[PDB]
Subunit: 314 residues, 4 copies
């Protein structure tokens, strides 16, 4: 009577099958949704990590057609100030903008004592989306905080996470979440897996959440386990609306830290990776190629039509 | 055709699925049972190995809220003397008997002088006798367990090692107050290489747990635990507690004396020096509490019976 | 739910089961077809790669009883001139047309000047035109295959690359005289890492073979072949023949000139591998041994009768 | 339509499950059969390889209670002379014929002079002729087995190598007194790499054992055995005994002479491995331990009663 719910698959267990194709990679549409109310021109979000997203990188992400979530490892007023820098910034045709033409930005909040105050300062600063973001989103604290943000600040979008199950997705949707963020123990050597023994392989987690939210209009953001552009394509076909990147964007020019030379190589103080735009271009190129192979003219087709093969270790 | 009973899974084949949670890691209850009659405040037991448990480490384990099993690689009177040091020795979780003395166990085999060893250990005040061999599903172990229960009814008796439902029932029938689970648990064990014998530990624990459900007989998971994550998995598979061996070897409290070699610290009697036992216990507990937080388990009973696993591939 | 088409197997997932045998390896027949109209005495084709097939290696492949496909990384007139060298050039197995000239093929893409390239190749006497791209299940390739068949009915045309039953039928319906099978066939392929796309080659071959059964259209297995054992497995999975690339690069006949570097021999424009005939002899030896083990007297039996066991990682 | 017959398992895919035990490892019986007519006191046979079995090692194997198969990479008279040395040669388990002489086998192929070789070996007193090729499920091996059985009805004959139920039945039908199982049994073997051919050895043994059940024809597991644990697994899958090759190469008794090279010992014509008896003792110890764990009092019980679990890579 070992209680095994299912066999769960990760990115390396699957490959996308080619299908009949008419639309070239350069001509497919990458338009998607972050939340019920926020559209993005490319399906990429930068993580709320202190080595990844502050105002500078959030601006660059919005300009590329994605969005940045400003991290919460700073004071309330400091975080609000970062949001303000993004909202007040003055050739980028794909730029993610609100109704006033200002760049979009998100900000992360936890569930600790001063969260209510943090949310109010972020909303007053013009934040587009508040991400109620903890290790365990299927919990009383996160569900209640999501509900509170939705009831107190009905004009801001709210994202809840992190989750990995159909049941958690429904609980957050029911609490009023405008999107959910998917990813608990998504990588092989994650702390969560080693220390706690907890996780769900990310391809199955995405598919389980996608099936649970089908017909609700609530997007899901895949957060974790993405190493190559090929994994971005697989995440979308599994049902993600977009994908959150973390350490992949750390060390870029726009990310926090200053450049440092050490033993004939460049680092930030993590290798120095140059302009964010070059990494985004490569990730997009790979997604466009995959859409070319699967014959998917747009994101809606990519999420719903192509098939996987499951493969062995060999 | 080929007689395959089942596919058997080990710790790395599975992960725990998060569930709805209301209780914080710091507030979950870790209380459990070692045996029908012995409660522990944390689910950890130190192994009866000569590099792990003598009086000193057994005292520290009892103080932490677990228990130590004193090894039998010593004379009868020496082993009895080790038990006495524990029984005659602030720590609010301390494992104590009805007289307020620290709890301790002691291992015995099935060889010629076992009866005499058991009598000296019982006279020394031992709380539990572990009838401990490579193969507990055998006439010798089953008979010795029965003998200890009948001769010394005030002492708790643990039988092992086993890996099957049928072995668990035979030991429960013989009067065992708990069973110890682990035969060829883990990849490069001698038992697997030399004899070709073993059962992956997650399946072994689940098979024994299902066999003993409703009997009140605890099962102790012994072997294959490398990280705190494995401790959580062992509990959800059905273990009541977990026995650690080489993980505690090299701690200050373990046998051996500290030795410096090429700028590093070791214990000497090969093993790295690991500092205070309390730091390792704190890490292991932290991990279990985090897992109970993720699965939404408020106590050990919920952790053992409610959460689910997902099975993963090599790529995971 | 997660849209999985199947579990797909590669060469290392399977082994051939021995069967009752009466015919010695040296006596089995290796005769097969490249296309509806072209027979080969051995089931080997050299890839249209610039480090593999120009006139010199194409001549040697034909002489061995196989065929070479001249690469297209050169001007139209240059490629035509390479075909002419082959057509105008003791070898009892030699692959020859009705006029007694050595057979040769030539690759073309789907870009602006393909029509002009095809016409020059056909005028040069090419036996088969390979319409060869990363994604054969596409409007561009299907239309180009149809165009070659309609405009030049007397030349054989091969379409590819494909990995599915549906793609095989689309190319057969467009008039292809054979199809070429292989998309993301190897472990560390760019297609898999960058795009997340591929089908393990044993399953791709079987799926295409089953789709084309009774049509008279051959399939050529292209990719993932490292040892002679893989050649035998490809044939039992349903391939009519197998295309080799980098395995033939560095042979005396392949492009490049020999170069000495740090006490070893290389080719330059890759280890020096000696005469093509020695590699062909090894590959054939292995296929003959496999036919001996399976009891297959000829290629038709090898493709249809023997069985595999599936094996684990261990 | 990929023609997959089954998933096939090797030694590392499985482990033996402990069962109720009453008999100690030192007290279990290891007696088994090589063929319909030849009993052995331990289930071990040395392979017909030129780095493994000539007269010297064959004598040592018989003395241990097993048997050696003398290799055929030598002239007919030379092979006959090796058999004679064994037949004309403190060891209570020794494998002996009715005349009290040590048992020995000898390998033959299917080439031009096989009939003459078999006759010389039989006249030299060989106990069993092993008709031994890469592919036993073939016209040549089946016919040769039948010929040996018809021409020399008083000698035992073994046919191989095979890996399927159907091949086992064809050899049993031809009159084989035992079959030898193993085609592409190891991971990096030539047959797999060059030809793409093989059957993982645990499945091959079980498939052959099921096909021969009730015929009285033994099966010998040949290949893929690296540890004593694999010997136990081979028996529980249905083998009657196990043939060892390179594991015995480099022993004192095996062919070659000892050579010192860079402070280590090798044999020269491979590490030097000391006395054969030490390796046999270790292999037997492991089998006895496994019989202790499974509760099997003898070989018949070990082959028919214990169960496996199947395990993953992580296990």
């Amino acid at each position: 009577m070992l209680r095994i719910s299912q066999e769960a698959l990760t990115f390396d267990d699957v490959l996308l099958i080619p299908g009949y194709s008419e639309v070239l990679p350069k001509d497919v549409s990458l338009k998607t949704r972050l939340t019920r109310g926020i559209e993005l021109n490319i399906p990429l979000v930068s993580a709320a990590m202190d080595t990844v997203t502050e105002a500078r990188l959030a601006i660059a992400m919005a300009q590329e057609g994605g969005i940045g979530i400003i991290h919460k490892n700073m004071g309330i007023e400091q975080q609000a100030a970062e949001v303000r820098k993004v909202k007040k910034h003055e050739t980028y045709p794909l730029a993610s903008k609100d109704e006033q033409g200002r760049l979009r930005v998100g900000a992360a909040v936890g569930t600790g004592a001063d969260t209510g105050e943090r949310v109010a300062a972020l909303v007053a600063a013009g934040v587009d989306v508040v991400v109620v973001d903890t290790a365990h989103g299927h919990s009383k604290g996160v569900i209640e905080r999501v509900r509170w943000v939705k009831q107190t600040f009905p004009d801001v979008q709210v994202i809840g996470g992190n989750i990995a199950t159909a049941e958690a997705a429904k609980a957050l949707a029911e609490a009023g979440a405008d999107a959910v963020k998917v990813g608990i123990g998504p990588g092989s050597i994650c702390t969560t897996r080693i220390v706690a023994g907890v996780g769900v392989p990310q391809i199955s987690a995405i598919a389980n959440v996608a099936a649970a939210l089908e017909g609700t209009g609530v997007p899901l953001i895949a957060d974790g386990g993405i190493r190559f552009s090929g994994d971005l394509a697989k995440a979308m076909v599994a049902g993600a609306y977009c994908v959150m990147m973390g350490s992949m964007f750390a060390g870029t020019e726009e990310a926090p830290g200053e450049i440092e030379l050490f033993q004939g190589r460049s680092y930030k103080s993590v290798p120095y990776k140059g302009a964010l735009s070059a990494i985004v271009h490569q990730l997009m190129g790979g997604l466009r190629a995959a859409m070319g192979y699967t014959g998917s003219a747009d994101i809606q087709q990519m999420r719903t039509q192509p098939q996987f093969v499951r493969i062995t270790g060999a």
